[PDB]
Amino acid sequence: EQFLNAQDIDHFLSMCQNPMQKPVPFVPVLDRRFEIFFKKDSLWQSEHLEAVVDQDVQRTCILHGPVAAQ
């Protein structure tokens, strides 16, 4: 029943940036790094929909060609 200590907010967000780890599957804050948080590691979710919020493809990103799709 106690909110996060400011020092623990900083710790959480710092360990959200650990390069030697798979990028976290969420956006933890809105700031200058919002584009990086939004776009990084965006292609694996289409083959692993069990790890998506509602197993919803419409949340994911799929690469496909406009003309080859015919």
Partner: protein, 48 residues
């Protein structure tokens, strides 16, 4: 300069016997919320 003064402070729990249970419970919830937000402000302000 002959400045004498006295104050009497009484324990706060004697106040709540003068109100109803619903008012007390509403106040207690309001104060719990305010304390959680004051803790967040205090620690952010302290470190920054």
């Amino acid at each position: 300069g002959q400045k004498g003064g006295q104050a009497i402070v009484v324990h706060p729990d004697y106040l709540y016997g003068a109100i109803t249970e619903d008012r007390y419970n509403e106040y207690v919830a309001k104060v719990s919320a305010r304390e959680k937000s004051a803790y967040k402000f205090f620690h952010n302000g302290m470190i920054y």
